[PDB]
Design an enzyme around this catalytic site. Structure first.
Site, PDB file in Angstrom:
ATOM      1  N   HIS A  74       0.803  -1.210   0.000  1.00 30.26           N
ATOM      2  CA  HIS A  74       0.000   0.000   0.000  1.00 30.26           C
ATOM      3  C   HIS A  74       0.837   1.261   0.000  1.00 30.26           C
TER       4      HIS A  74
ATOM      5  N   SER B 147      -0.161  -0.969  -6.585  1.00 25.99           N
ATOM      6  CA  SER B 147       0.112  -2.098  -7.452  1.00 25.99           C
ATOM      7  C   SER B 147       0.851  -1.650  -8.706  1.00 25.99           C
TER       8      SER B 147
ATOM      9  N   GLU C  79       3.769 -34.475  -0.957  1.00 23.07           N
ATOM     10  CA  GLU C  79       2.608 -34.056  -1.724  1.00 23.07           C
ATOM     11  C   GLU C  79       3.055 -33.154  -2.866  1.00 23.07           C
TER      12      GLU C  79
ATOM     13  N   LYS D 213     -14.706  -7.580  -9.998  1.00 19.72           N
ATOM     14  CA  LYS D 213     -13.771  -8.417 -10.747  1.00 19.72           C
ATOM     15  C   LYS D 213     -13.204  -9.544  -9.874  1.00 19.72           C
ATOM     16  N   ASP D 214     -12.878  -9.233  -8.613  1.00 16.38           N
ATOM     17  CA  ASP D 214     -12.453 -10.289  -7.706  1.00 16.38           C
ATOM     18  C   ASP D 214     -13.595 -11.227  -7.381  1.00 16.38           C
TER      19      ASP D 214
HETATM   20  C1  HEC Z   1      -6.418 -25.825  13.333  1.00 16.16           C
HETATM   21  C2  HEC Z   1      -6.092 -24.933  12.403  1.00 16.16           C
HETATM   22  C3  HEC Z   1      -5.487 -25.268  11.029  1.00 16.16           C
HETATM   23  C4  HEC Z   1      -5.060 -24.310  10.246  1.00 16.16           C
HETATM   24  C5  HEC Z   1      -5.117 -22.827  10.641  1.00 16.16           C
HETATM   25  C6  HEC Z   1      -4.555 -24.895   9.030  1.00 16.16           C
HETATM   26  N1  HEC Z   1      -4.703 -26.258   9.112  1.00 16.16           N
HETATM   27 FE1  HEC Z   1      -3.882 -27.485   7.672  1.00 16.16          FE
HETATM   28  N2  HEC Z   1      -4.640 -29.007   8.936  1.00 16.16           N
HETATM   29  C7  HEC Z   1      -5.254 -28.924  10.162  1.00 16.16           C
HETATM   30  C8  HEC Z   1      -5.480 -30.235  10.706  1.00 16.16           C
HETATM   31  C9  HEC Z   1      -6.139 -30.526  12.063  1.00 16.16           C
HETATM   32  C10 HEC Z   1      -5.013 -31.103   9.827  1.00 16.16           C
HETATM   33  C11 HEC Z   1      -5.005 -32.638   9.947  1.00 16.16           C
HETATM   34  C12 HEC Z   1      -6.365 -33.240   9.635  1.00 16.16           C
HETATM   35  C13 HEC Z   1      -6.494 -33.490   8.164  1.00 16.16           C
HETATM   36  O1  HEC Z   1      -5.460 -33.626   7.478  1.00 16.16           O
HETATM   37  O2  HEC Z   1      -7.643 -33.562   7.678  1.00 16.16           O
HETATM   38  C14 HEC Z   1      -4.481 -30.353   8.713  1.00 16.16           C
HETATM   39  C15 HEC Z   1      -3.910 -30.900   7.607  1.00 16.16           C
HETATM   40  C16 HEC Z   1      -3.343 -30.211   6.576  1.00 16.16           C
HETATM   41  C17 HEC Z   1      -2.811 -30.813   5.389  1.00 16.16           C
HETATM   42  C18 HEC Z   1      -2.804 -32.314   5.066  1.00 16.16           C
HETATM   43  C19 HEC Z   1      -4.191 -32.674   4.561  1.00 16.16           C
HETATM   44  C20 HEC Z   1      -4.269 -34.146   4.310  1.00 16.16           C
HETATM   45  O3  HEC Z   1      -5.251 -34.771   4.777  1.00 16.16           O
HETATM   46  O4  HEC Z   1      -3.345 -34.687   3.654  1.00 16.16           O
HETATM   47  C21 HEC Z   1      -2.341 -29.851   4.620  1.00 16.16           C
HETATM   48  C22 HEC Z   1      -1.682 -30.058   3.248  1.00 16.16           C
HETATM   49  C23 HEC Z   1      -2.555 -28.599   5.297  1.00 16.16           C
HETATM   50  N3  HEC Z   1      -3.172 -28.853   6.495  1.00 16.16           N
HETATM   51  C24 HEC Z   1      -2.209 -27.360   4.840  1.00 16.16           C
HETATM   52  C25 HEC Z   1      -2.559 -26.187   5.450  1.00 16.16           C
HETATM   53  C26 HEC Z   1      -2.263 -24.866   4.959  1.00 16.16           C
HETATM   54  C27 HEC Z   1      -1.503 -24.660   3.630  1.00 16.16           C
HETATM   55  C28 HEC Z   1      -2.784 -23.989   5.832  1.00 16.16           C
HETATM   56  C29 HEC Z   1      -2.793 -22.445   5.886  1.00 16.16           C
HETATM   57  C30 HEC Z   1      -1.927 -21.639   5.266  1.00 16.16           C
HETATM   58  C31 HEC Z   1      -3.391 -24.747   6.892  1.00 16.16           C
HETATM   59  N4  HEC Z   1      -3.241 -26.078   6.629  1.00 16.16           N
HETATM   60  C32 HEC Z   1      -4.017 -24.203   7.980  1.00 16.16           C
HETATM   61  C33 HEC Z   1      -5.598 -27.770  10.776  1.00 16.16           C
HETATM   62  C34 HEC Z   1      -5.280 -26.522  10.335  1.00 16.16           C
HETATM   63  C1  HEC Z   2       6.977 -14.131  -3.050  1.00 14.12           C
HETATM   64  C2  HEC Z   2       6.054 -13.623  -3.836  1.00 14.12           C
HETATM   65  C3  HEC Z   2       4.787 -13.347  -3.205  1.00 14.12           C
HETATM   66  C4  HEC Z   2       4.142 -14.178  -2.368  1.00 14.12           C
HETATM   67  C5  HEC Z   2       4.612 -15.525  -1.979  1.00 14.12           C
HETATM   68  C6  HEC Z   2       2.983 -13.560  -1.970  1.00 14.12           C
HETATM   69  N1  HEC Z   2       2.928 -12.352  -2.549  1.00 14.12           N
HETATM   70 FE1  HEC Z   2       1.370 -11.008  -2.644  1.00 14.12          FE
HETATM   71  N2  HEC Z   2       2.257  -9.930  -3.839  1.00 14.12           N
HETATM   72  C7  HEC Z   2       3.475 -10.126  -4.311  1.00 14.12           C
HETATM   73  C8  HEC Z   2       3.830  -9.069  -5.215  1.00 14.12           C
HETATM   74  C9  HEC Z   2       5.135  -8.971  -5.926  1.00 14.12           C
HETATM   75  C10 HEC Z   2       2.788  -8.247  -5.261  1.00 14.12           C
HETATM   76  C11 HEC Z   2       2.685  -6.989  -6.053  1.00 14.12           C
HETATM   77  C12 HEC Z   2       2.058  -7.255  -7.399  1.00 14.12           C
HETATM   78  C13 HEC Z   2       2.719  -6.358  -8.385  1.00 14.12           C
HETATM   79  O1  HEC Z   2       3.819  -6.636  -8.893  1.00 14.12           O
HETATM   80  O2  HEC Z   2       2.145  -5.313  -8.687  1.00 14.12           O
HETATM   81  C14 HEC Z   2       1.790  -8.811  -4.371  1.00 14.12           C
HETATM   82  C15 HEC Z   2       0.566  -8.217  -4.178  1.00 14.12           C
HETATM   83  C16 HEC Z   2      -0.358  -8.780  -3.355  1.00 14.12           C
HETATM   84  C17 HEC Z   2      -1.663  -8.317  -3.183  1.00 14.12           C
HETATM   85  C18 HEC Z   2      -2.335  -7.164  -3.833  1.00 14.12           C
HETATM   86  C19 HEC Z   2      -3.210  -7.697  -4.954  1.00 14.12           C
HETATM   87  C20 HEC Z   2      -2.290  -8.172  -6.029  1.00 14.12           C
HETATM   88  O3  HEC Z   2      -2.610  -9.087  -6.806  1.00 14.12           O
HETATM   89  O4  HEC Z   2      -1.184  -7.632  -6.155  1.00 14.12           O
HETATM   90  C21 HEC Z   2      -2.265  -9.100  -2.291  1.00 14.12           C
HETATM   91  C22 HEC Z   2      -3.667  -8.989  -1.795  1.00 14.12           C
HETATM   92  C23 HEC Z   2      -1.354 -10.055  -1.897  1.00 14.12           C
HETATM   93  N3  HEC Z   2      -0.190  -9.848  -2.543  1.00 14.12           N
HETATM   94  C24 HEC Z   2      -1.647 -11.026  -0.996  1.00 14.12           C
HETATM   95  C25 HEC Z   2      -0.793 -12.083  -0.816  1.00 14.12           C
HETATM   96  C26 HEC Z   2      -1.156 -13.127   0.014  1.00 14.12           C
HETATM   97  C27 HEC Z   2      -2.432 -13.211   0.765  1.00 14.12           C
HETATM   98  C28 HEC Z   2      -0.153 -14.004  -0.006  1.00 14.12           C
HETATM   99  C29 HEC Z   2      -0.096 -15.252   0.728  1.00 14.12           C
HETATM  100  C30 HEC Z   2      -0.774 -15.312   1.854  1.00 14.12           C
HETATM  101  C31 HEC Z   2       0.865 -13.448  -0.884  1.00 14.12           C
HETATM  102  N4  HEC Z   2       0.398 -12.295  -1.335  1.00 14.12           N
HETATM  103  C32 HEC Z   2       2.053 -14.096  -1.131  1.00 14.12           C
HETATM  104  C33 HEC Z   2       4.374 -11.136  -4.070  1.00 14.12           C
HETATM  105  C34 HEC Z   2       4.024 -12.197  -3.314  1.00 14.12           C
HETATM  106  C1  UQ6 Z   3      -3.951  -4.124  -4.313  1.00 17.05           C
HETATM  107  O1  UQ6 Z   3      -5.356  -4.042  -4.155  1.00 17.05           O
HETATM  108  C2  UQ6 Z   3      -5.840  -4.869  -3.182  1.00 17.05           C
HETATM  109  C3  UQ6 Z   3      -5.863  -4.467  -1.849  1.00 17.05           C
HETATM  110  O2  UQ6 Z   3      -5.352  -3.260  -1.479  1.00 17.05           O
HETATM  111  C4  UQ6 Z   3      -6.392  -5.298  -0.876  1.00 17.05           C
HETATM  112  C5  UQ6 Z   3      -6.376  -4.830   0.552  1.00 17.05           C
HETATM  113  C6  UQ6 Z   3      -6.907  -6.537  -1.209  1.00 17.05           C
HETATM  114  C7  UQ6 Z   3      -7.528  -7.473  -0.192  1.00 17.05           C
HETATM  115  C8  UQ6 Z   3      -6.644  -8.412   0.601  1.00 17.05           C
HETATM  116  C9  UQ6 Z   3      -7.190  -9.331   1.380  1.00 17.05           C
HETATM  117  C10 UQ6 Z   3      -8.686  -9.477   1.494  1.00 17.05           C
HETATM  118  C11 UQ6 Z   3      -6.345 -10.276   2.200  1.00 17.05           C
HETATM  119  C12 UQ6 Z   3      -6.725 -10.096   3.677  1.00 17.05           C
HETATM  120  C13 UQ6 Z   3      -6.457 -11.337   4.500  1.00 17.05           C
HETATM  121  C14 UQ6 Z   3      -6.365 -11.305   5.816  1.00 17.05           C
HETATM  122  C15 UQ6 Z   3      -6.514 -10.019   6.587  1.00 17.05           C
HETATM  123  C16 UQ6 Z   3      -6.099 -12.579   6.577  1.00 17.05           C
HETATM  124  C17 UQ6 Z   3      -7.004 -12.684   7.811  1.00 17.05           C
HETATM  125  C18 UQ6 Z   3      -7.615 -14.064   7.830  1.00 17.05           C
HETATM  126  C19 UQ6 Z   3      -8.381 -14.527   8.794  1.00 17.05           C
HETATM  127  C20 UQ6 Z   3      -8.919 -15.927   8.659  1.00 17.05           C
HETATM  128  C21 UQ6 Z   3      -8.741 -13.706  10.007  1.00 17.05           C
HETATM  129  C22 UQ6 Z   3      -8.767 -14.576  11.271  1.00 17.05           C
HETATM  130  C23 UQ6 Z   3     -10.178 -14.774  11.788  1.00 17.05           C
HETATM  131  C24 UQ6 Z   3     -10.544 -15.868  12.424  1.00 17.05           C
HETATM  132  C25 UQ6 Z   3      -9.562 -16.979  12.679  1.00 17.05           C
HETATM  133  C26 UQ6 Z   3     -11.963 -16.015  12.918  1.00 17.05           C
HETATM  134  C27 UQ6 Z   3     -12.456 -17.450  12.720  1.00 17.05           C
HETATM  135  C28 UQ6 Z   3     -13.140 -17.924  13.978  1.00 17.05           C
HETATM  136  C29 UQ6 Z   3     -14.081 -18.842  13.988  1.00 17.05           C
HETATM  137  C30 UQ6 Z   3     -14.537 -19.488  12.702  1.00 17.05           C
HETATM  138  C31 UQ6 Z   3     -14.687 -19.229  15.318  1.00 17.05           C
HETATM  139  C32 UQ6 Z   3     -15.727 -20.345  15.207  1.00 17.05           C
HETATM  140  C33 UQ6 Z   3     -16.218 -20.730  16.582  1.00 17.05           C
HETATM  141  C34 UQ6 Z   3     -17.461 -20.548  16.965  1.00 17.05           C
HETATM  142  C35 UQ6 Z   3     -17.883 -20.957  18.349  1.00 17.05           C
HETATM  143  C36 UQ6 Z   3     -18.489 -19.930  16.053  1.00 17.05           C
HETATM  144  C37 UQ6 Z   3      -6.913  -6.912  -2.533  1.00 17.05           C
HETATM  145  O3  UQ6 Z   3      -7.433  -8.116  -2.850  1.00 17.05           O
HETATM  146  C38 UQ6 Z   3      -6.390  -6.094  -3.531  1.00 17.05           C
HETATM  147  O4  UQ6 Z   3      -6.393  -6.510  -4.832  1.00 17.05           O
HETATM  148  C39 UQ6 Z   3      -7.613  -6.088  -5.451  1.00 17.05           C
END
Ligand code: HEC
Ligand code: HEC
Ligand code: UQ6
Ligand code: CN3
Ligand code: 8PE
Ligand code: HEC
Ligand code: HEC
Ligand code: HEC
Ligand code: UQ6
Ligand code: 6PH
Ligand code: 6PH
Ligand code: 9PE
Ligand code: 9PE
Ligand code: 7PH
Lengths: 93, 385, 248, 126, 54, 385, 93
Positions: B202, B206, B272, B228-229
């Site tokens: 930011h 971009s 994997e 678009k997203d």
């Molecule tokens: C509790 C929070 C939780 C988060 C947050 C989470 N996972 Fe997992 N994940 C699990 C659990 C529990 C398992 C094992 C159960 C299963 O594999 O179904 C798992 C399993 C996996 C597996 C193996 C799946 C399979 O069955 O082979 C992969 C790959 C994975 N996670 C990737 C990710 C990635 C990538 C992210 C986020 C960037 C992520 N997980 C976030 C809970 C989580």
């Molecule tokens: C290592 C490379 C790389 C990784 C990995 C990466 N980003 Fe980016 N991301 C970028 C670059 C570079 C840009 C700027 C795009 C450009 O060149 O204008 C960007 C831009 C973005 C943007 C703005 C929208 C867009 O398309 O540019 C978002 C949202 C974003 N990243 C989210 C993520 C998220 C969420 C992850 C993983 C959780 C991630 N990025 C991982 C390199 C990365």
């Molecule tokens: C360059 O222009 C942009 C731009 O500026 C931005 C900001 C974005 C937008 C970026 C995003 C939306 C990414 C943001 C991602 C995060 C902030 C990650 C946060 C992720 C989370 C999952 C937050 C954590 C929240 C929880 C873990 C709550 C879950 C809890 C639960 C489910 C409890 C359940 C239990 C009971 C009892 C109900 C763009 O896509 C983009 O391109 C158009």
């Protein structure tokens, strides 16, 4: 809040591009505009233009690496067969 | 002023997803960032609702996963979304990093953004590996064993580091319990790194697919790139719904439904599908220590990228040879994955070595030489003397 | 590896539950359970399949109850701490024939018979592999193969040498519905039954997949329309440029 | 990060030699019209990335009318890339109009920064 | 103007959205269940329960 | 400019903990915020390193806690720090909220800050309750049972809500597993709410113990309040080290070392020490539904606080009657805790009802009436007519 | 970045207090200053001043509630003894 450094993007009003003059825009409301009037003839001819200018840079590396993978896989399944077992003996040792 | 501008909380929502000035020429490749955010939310929510039924003992891990897939209502939806969504998370992240390499988003003034991206990539590989070991199948157990023995290659210290990682003498109950705790923990670090990533984005906005400035014709975020997203969000959910509901076990390896047996080694131990290029890079080096160093250098060589791109125009859009060698690199990365999926057999060793060399040569020799030649060719094409 | 260590490739049999709309054949699952109980269950556990999952799938309520009450499970002990048994109920699991691993390896020449709850989902090829494994034993191994004594040959097993016996012969079981019970019929029935045992969600998974793919395809086309709609002011935008008066 | 003095030195060494010019100037303009920045209505000095302070200086140096023309060419390029079309053949930048107009401003800013760095790191004639 | 008063207030607009979504969930569930049972006639368990009459 | 001001990441570190303009008259009561941040970091780090050894089955929870206290190296340090630090976390949070009520930090323009504080307080009570149920002792099991039956008091819906919470029909294995998952989850929501809390603070700066502006004499954060917070950090670690190493089981209840038995009810079911005023408020109402509504209203009545303080000067520093009735309120809150620790016996029921009434009367009747009288008394003391 | 609303704290330079004039500061370096010269006589007499002006607002509510708790606890342990069991009978019913 504190000041920050010089960025290359400002905001609406002071965005930071060059000063521009005498360049006029013209746009029509989309309620009086028909959307997707340019899908037919467009998805044929423009898509063929976008494919023709841009396919060969993808098709030559895919061709090179797929031919190299196919030749390697064919040589694998040759030398682990009965015909090439002495060649497997001399290249594995 | 307006309430979305004067409130403390809504000013961030405003300046990030409502009134953010985006360049008006960006195509659908600038949508993978929003798509990765959606897929991270999917992974976290399914992880919580599936980790309410998971017991992380080594004698109760695989039985609890099958308890999720059998006894829990809609639990097959949760596990299949979770595993196949991790596969789509790495696929969209690979496409996002390829968008970064192609259009030159790594160059100045966006080096901080690129470095935080590489940190997010390393943390995501770590999260996927830990969660794959939490299943405790056959592939999970033996992959954990091979990766930690690779950590035992470190000289004079490594065996005690590995006895620290294992919490014992082999992959046992403390190993699986600490892998589940770390695997629950590291995605929140990924969320914090994503927020830092958005900040570093930011402060300059971009890029655009032309490689020129975009300060002249900006259009807001709201309704334009929101819808678009929304288009690509619905396409992503459609393809994820196909690979969850109609063919869930395609991307996985069938040996992972055998319970973890420390005595029986498998016929072919393979990670994997997405860690296979890195596994091929490591397997191509005939040394353990140099193999581990080369595997981590294959990610740090993305950090050495903005200092070698000597092209004076941003991005590979209007350059011929850089675009050609970019697709050479992409299909080389696919060939690394396919070499790694195979056995240690003639001629896959020699092809793995050549493919690793072309990987590092693209990042270290091909890009600066081709960019210098392209600069001089652009100059002498139009300057007459 | 050669093709011998990798094993022969199981072909593409046209099952009645392939395709994105076809479900299981539940009569075939019922007959597959009968062939399981009368052939496999002497030597294969089914530890992850409870009795209650068969109610309404392959058998009725009283049929599952009167099949589960033939077995004995561990009751809670009596008022003197003596261990006692009880007949089974709907909430218990299908018991294995062997009390532990060492009895299995003793009764099967060292080889451990794997639990068949997930065996069609834990082998590459799956249904085709299990069917070709059962119906793939030659009458005699090919010339030049020295089998270790106590092991058997079929080309579909990785390595060629398997420790199973050919246990599907003509009409060793009788079917309740009068179907001719040849070897291939029984193998098709048990492979369908093991597909049910590994994937009991299969029917509901495919119908919820139908609902989700329909709703998301409709949402994707509607969102394409709304994106082409709200961008119509920006796609059709035009710019003309008359260069300004240079005196300023 | 090419430091325009260096690319200018290499290009002038190629142009002043007859053999190298006769060899790789047809390759050069073949590369130019396969690059296809003309077809979006751009010039190559409109294409140099301008997010470093020396190029920002060379854009402040520029006269007014060329700055307004450069701004129009950028906005028409963004609009044409947005519609995923190309400009019609009458509106393409021709070969004679692809003039290196911003190159001398860039080169004098290069020489100024180079001279500032050299004088910032001088010894003394003892 | 005949339908625009049906779209003018946002309250009646989202009320139409929720009423139609309720009706769509009910009708779509019943229709997809009926088609998925009709396509697989002779394989579901109520068919085998009807055939095996013993 | 400087690098701590021009960098994107270090500008937040600058504008929050280096160059933040603080009022130069704030005493040690403006240090509980930094102390709560330190104690939250303590809770999270001990929670991770202790949840690497925790198995959340109902048959393996108490045995795994004792495995931590016996077999894990320095595990007694981890558990004792964790439980006693949760006790200190609530004690420092109670002192912080009392600093908020006393010096009038809830008043305008800091209503957003106060509301985010109340949200943090509710989430912290939820986290402590879930983690106390994760022990699965006697008090853990029966406290979970009583609180969820209190959720069953909700009319026409409540029984299905409670069967949803339990994941069964009583407090069983799915209940303890989902309490461990939620208990791992909610502290990161607390960390996000803390960041939102710091934002809503930073848009107007801290108050001061005089109730006048502090825009005139500001001193920076760095070295001044850094070393003042370092003083109270070392005092807090000293008192925590005393109650961990020399007397660890004082604050806990000894029934929690009996394993969870659903058949034997205890002689006196009491929560851990800080939830006792709220338990007394709920036990004082002779109805289940009105009891649950009164228990949640005892926290929402902190939200109705900035709209009833009609005093025109900020804070109770220079006012007599408001200061006196504030200490009436504080010792009433202590008396609520001590009523709740006792049995349902004469006369503790009548005293619990009177004490609940004086709690709500302080928040709804005493503050506006005493503030109005104090305003008129300040006016007519100095204006002559 | 976007502008924000009017706050009541600015930053170093534009903090937002009233304009001030003719008010001079005087401070000495702490290297030439002796720290903790004011601990003795200070922690006695200033601490007694800070206690005397400020104790009674704490001591009267503590006295009221401790006396009320003590009277209630004494009445509890009375009526659950043998002497007051008929009073427990008549007030528990
Ligand atoms: C509790 C929070 C939780 C988060 C947050 C989470 N996972 Fe997992 N994940 C699990 C659990 C529990 C398992 C094992 C159960 C299963 O594999 O179904 C798992 C399993 C996996 C597996 C193996 C799946 C399979 O069955 O082979 C992969 C790959 C994975 N996670 C990737 C990710 C990635 C990538 C992210 C986020 C960037 C992520 N997980 C976030 C809970 C989580
Ligand atoms: C290592 C490379 C790389 C990784 C990995 C990466 N980003 Fe980016 N991301 C970028 C670059 C570079 C840009 C700027 C795009 C450009 O060149 O204008 C960007 C831009 C973005 C943007 C703005 C929208 C867009 O398309 O540019 C978002 C949202 C974003 N990243 C989210 C993520 C998220 C969420 C992850 C993983 C959780 C991630 N990025 C991982 C390199 C990365
Ligand atoms: C360059 O222009 C942009 C731009 O500026 C931005 C900001 C974005 C937008 C970026 C995003 C939306 C990414 C943001 C991602 C995060 C902030 C990650 C946060 C992720 C989370 C999952 C937050 C954590 C929240 C929880 C873990 C709550 C879950 C809890 C639960 C489910 C409890 C359940 C239990 C009971 C009892 C109900 C763009 O896509 C983009 O391109 C158009
Ligand atoms: C229970 C578990 C909690 C765990 C938290 C650990 C931290 C405890 C915090 C307690 C607290 O913050 O009270 C602050 C209170 C008000 O402070 P003040 O600014 O008005 O006084 C200025 C000082 O003279 C400046 O003097 P100076 O700043 O130079 O040194 C202060 C003192 C440090 O002590 C403390 O921080 C509190 C003990 O250094 C010493 O000389 C100590 C000598 C051994 O200090 C006082 O002066 C006492 C007044 C009565 C408070 C009683 C508290 C009962 C609840
Ligand atoms: C649900 C909502 C939560 C509600 C939380 C309920 C209260 C939790 C209890 C936490 C204890 C916190 C005590 C109050 C903290 C604020 C007190 C304070 O501000 O101290 C300063 C006060 C007056 O000092 P001045 O600022 O007015 O001095 C200006 C000089 N002219 O100085 C004083 O008057 C003396 C301060 C002495 C503190 C005494 C604390 C008593 C603690 C209870 C003891 C229990 C055992 C009996
Ligand atoms: C894994 C991360 C984790 C975090 C983060 C965490 N805890 Fe805990 N907590 C645990 C575990 C595991 C237990 C159960 C083991 C134990 O009690 O020793 C526990 C137990 C507790 C207990 C009961 C202690 C006992 O033995 O009676 C309390 C009280 C508690 N947590 C409060 C908190 C508070 C308050 C916070 C933060 C605001 C917090 N916890 C954060 C893991 C965590
Ligand atoms: C003679 C005893 C015996 C009987 C009877 C028997 N099995 Fe096996 N089966 C085995 C043994 C032993 C193995 C494992 C042998 C090995 O690993 O080499 C095995 C393995 C299998 C395997 C997997 C083999 C592999 O390589 O993965 C399947 C599938 C299988 N049995 C199905 C069945 C079915 C179906 C039946 C009943 C129809 C059955 N078996 C009856 C002994 C038996
Ligand atoms: C319910 C009230 C409340 C709770 C609970 C609360 N806060 Fe505060 N916090 C405040 C108020 C009010 C202020 C500002 C008061 C003032 O400056 O006059 C504040 C200020 C702060 C400050 C600035 C320093 C200070 O003492 O003013 C920090 C840091 C802080 N809070 C952190 C936290 C943390 C961390 C937590 C627990 C996770 C927390 N707060 C819980 C109300 C609360
Ligand atoms: C008003 O002026 C301020 C002020 O602005 C601020 C910010 C603070 C400071 C307040 C805080 C810092 C509180 C905020 C607290 C948080 C944001 C909590 C953050 C904590 C976490 C996110 C958890 C910590 C997580 C880790 C350290 C991850 C590493 C942990 C583990 C277990 C990895 C170990 C694994 C291996 C394999 C070694 C003040 O104290 C203050 O008053 C002076
Ligand atoms: C944190 C997770 C990140 C996920 C990335 C998602 C990116 C896209 C988000 C789309 C939000 C759409 C809001 C548009 C809007 O409110 O416009 C509002 C009104 O528009 C609408 O009513 C849109 C119809 C309803 C669409 C509902 C889509 C829900 C499905 C979301 C699936 C992903 C969660 C303002 O529109 P206007 O300014 O043109 O008048
Ligand atoms: C996220 C966790 C929040 C916890 C709240 C902690 C608040 C107090 C933090 C204290 C940091 C001290 C840094 C001061 C400093 O660097 O000054 C530096 C140098 O000062 C010092 O060297 C201090 C000596 C070393 C003290 C080490 C204390 C470590 C114990 C910390 C325990 C809590 C983590 C700048 O000092 P100067 O500007 O006066 O020259
Ligand atoms: C690490 C960062 C994690 C993410 C945090 C940053 C992103 C936060 C986005 C939050 C979006 C939702 C917040 C909208 C709420 C706006 C209401 C509001 O600001 O009114 C606030 C009051 O808010 C509250 O009482 C509690 C808000 C707690 C929020 C809990 C989510 C009043 O604000 P204000 O002072 O401008 O109003 C003056 C009246 N004319
Ligand atoms: C829990 C946090 C929640 C979110 C709050 C965000 C606040 C984060 C506080 C982090 C403070 C410590 C960060 C120090 C990093 C400063 C280094 C730096 O900015 O150098 C940057 C480069 O940064 C990197 O490459 C790696 C940054 C990774 C940071 C991961 C922790 C130099 O970049 P520069 O600002 O000079 O821009 C010139 C453009 N070429
Ligand atoms: C919390 C993030 C979850 C995102 C899931 C996206 C992945 C796509 C597969 C979803 C399948 C799971 C749901 C399901 O099985 O429903 C099935 C129906 O399919 C659908 O309608 C899914 C459409 C998805 C639309 C997404 C809307 C966005 C909501 C954001 C959260 C409020 C089952 O329906 P039923 O239980 O019979 O009512």
């Amino acid at each position: 809040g504190p000041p920050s450094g010089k960025t290359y993007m400002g905001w609406w009003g002071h965005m930071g591009g060059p000063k521009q003059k005498g360049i006029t825009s013209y746009a029509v409301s989309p309620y009086a505009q028909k959307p997707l009037q340019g899908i037919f003839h467009n998805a044929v001819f423009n898509s063929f233009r976008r494919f023709k200018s841009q396919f060969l840079y993808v098709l030559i590396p895919a061709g090179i690496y797929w031919y190299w993978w196919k030749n390697g896989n064919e040589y694998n399944e040759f030398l682990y067969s009965k015909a090439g077992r002495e060649e497997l003996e001399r290249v594995n040792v | 002023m307006a309430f979305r501008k004067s409130n403390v909380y809504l000013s961030l929502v405003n300046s990030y997803i409502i009134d953010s000035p985006q360049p008006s020429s960006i195509n659908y490749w600038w949508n993978m960032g929003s798509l990765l955010g959606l897929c991270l939310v999917i992974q976290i929510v399914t992880g919580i609702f599936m980790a309410m039924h998971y017991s992380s003992n080594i004698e109760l891990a695989f039985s609890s996963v099958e308890h999720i897939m059998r006894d829990v209502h809609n639990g097959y939806i949760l596990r299949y979304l979770h595993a196949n969504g991790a596969s789509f998370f790495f696929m969209v992240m690979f496409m996002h990093m390829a968008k970064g390499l192609y259009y030159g988003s790594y160059r100045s003034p966006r080096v901080t953004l690129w470095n935080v991206g590489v940190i997010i990539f390393i943390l995501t590989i770590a999260t996927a590996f830990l969660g794959y070991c939490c299943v405790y199948g056959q592939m999970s157990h033996w992959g954990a064993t091979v990766i930690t023995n690779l950590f035992s290659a470190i000289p004079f210290v490594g065996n005690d580091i590995v006895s620290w990682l294992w919490g014992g003498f082999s992959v046992s109950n403390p190993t699986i319990q600490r892998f589940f705790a770390l695997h629950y923990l590291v995605p929140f670090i990924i969320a914090a790194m994503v927020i830092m990533h958005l900040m570093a984005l930011h402060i300059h906005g971009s890029s655009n697919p032309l490689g020129i400035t975009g300060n002249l014709d900006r259009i807001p975020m709201h309704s334009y790139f929101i819808f678009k997203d929304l288009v690509t969000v619905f396409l992503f959910m459609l393809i994820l719904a196909l690979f969850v509901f109609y063919s869930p076990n395609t991307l996985g390896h069938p040996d992972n439904y055998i319970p973890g047996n420390p005595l029986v080694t498998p016929a072919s131990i393979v990670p994997e599908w997405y860690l296979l290029p890195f596994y091929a890079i490591l397997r191509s080096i005939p040394d353990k220590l140099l193999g581990v160093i080369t595997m981590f250098a294959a990610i740090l060589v993305l950090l050495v990228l903005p200092f070698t791109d000597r092209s004076v125009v941003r991005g590979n859009t209007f350059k011929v040879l850089s675009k050609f060698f970019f697709f050479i690199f992409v299909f080389n990365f696919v060939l690394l994955g396919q070499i790694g999926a195979c056995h240690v057999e003639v001629p896959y060793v020699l092809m793995g070595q050549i493919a690793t060399f072309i990987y590092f040569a693209y990042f270290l020799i091909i890009v600066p030489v081709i960019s210098t030649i392209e600069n001089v060719l652009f100059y002498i094409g139009r300057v007459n003397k | 590896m050669t093709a011998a260590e990798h094993g022969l490739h199981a072909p593409a049999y046209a099952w009645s539950h392939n395709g994105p709309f076809e479900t299981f054949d539940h009569a075939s699952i019922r007959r597959g359970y009968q062939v399981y109980r009368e052939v496999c269950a002497a030597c294969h556990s089914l530890d992850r399949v409870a009795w209650r999952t068969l109610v309404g799938v392959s058998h009725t309520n009283e049929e599952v109850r009167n099949m589960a009450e033939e077995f004995e499970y561990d009751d809670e002990p009596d008022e003197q701490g003596n261990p006692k048994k009880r007949p089974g109920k709907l909430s218990d699991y299908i018991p294995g024939p062997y009390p532990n691993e060492q009895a299995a390896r003793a009764a099967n020449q060292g080889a451990l018979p794997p639990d068949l709850s997930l065996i069609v989902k834990a082998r590459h090829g799956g249904c085709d592999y299990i069917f070709s494994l059962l119906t793939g034993y030659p009458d005699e191994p090919p010339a030049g193969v020295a089998l270790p004594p106590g092991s058997n040959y079929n080309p579909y097993f990785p390595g060629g040498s398997i420790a199973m016996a050919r246990v599907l012969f003509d009409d060793m079981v009788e079917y309740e519905d009068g179907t001719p019970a040849t070897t291939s019929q029984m193998a098709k029935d048990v492979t369908t039954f093991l597909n049910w045992c590994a994937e009991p969600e299969h029917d509901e998974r495919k119908r919820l997949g139908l609902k989700t793919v329909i709703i998301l395809s409709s949402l994707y086309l509607l969102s394409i329309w709304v994106k082409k709609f709200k961008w119509a002011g920006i796609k059709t935008r035009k710019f003309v440029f008359n260069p300004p008066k240079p005196r300023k | 990060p090419q430091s325009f003095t260096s690319i200018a030195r290499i290009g002038d060494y190629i142009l002043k030699s007859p053999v190298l010019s006769k060899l790789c100037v047809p390759v050069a303009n073949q590369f130019i019209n396969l690059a296809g920045y003309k077809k979006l209505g751009l010039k190559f000095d409109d294409l140099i990335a301008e997010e470093n302070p020396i190029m920002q200086t060379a854009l402040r140096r520029l006269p007014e009318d060329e700055s307004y023309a450069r701004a129009y060419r950028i906005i028409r390029a963004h609009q044409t890339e947005l519609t995923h079309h190309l400009l019609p053949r009458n509106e393409w930048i021709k070969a004679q109009e692809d003039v290196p107009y911003l190159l001398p401003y860039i080169l004098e800013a290069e020489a100024a920064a180079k001279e500032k760095d050299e004088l910032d790191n001088i010894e003394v004639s003892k | 103007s005949l339908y625009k008063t049906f779209f003018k207030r946002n309250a009646v607009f989202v009320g139409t959205i929720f009423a139609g979504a309720f009706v769509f969930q009910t009708v779509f569930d019943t229709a997809i269940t009926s088609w998925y049972e009709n396509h697989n006639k002779g394989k579901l368990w109520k068919d085998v329960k009807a055939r095996i009459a013993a």
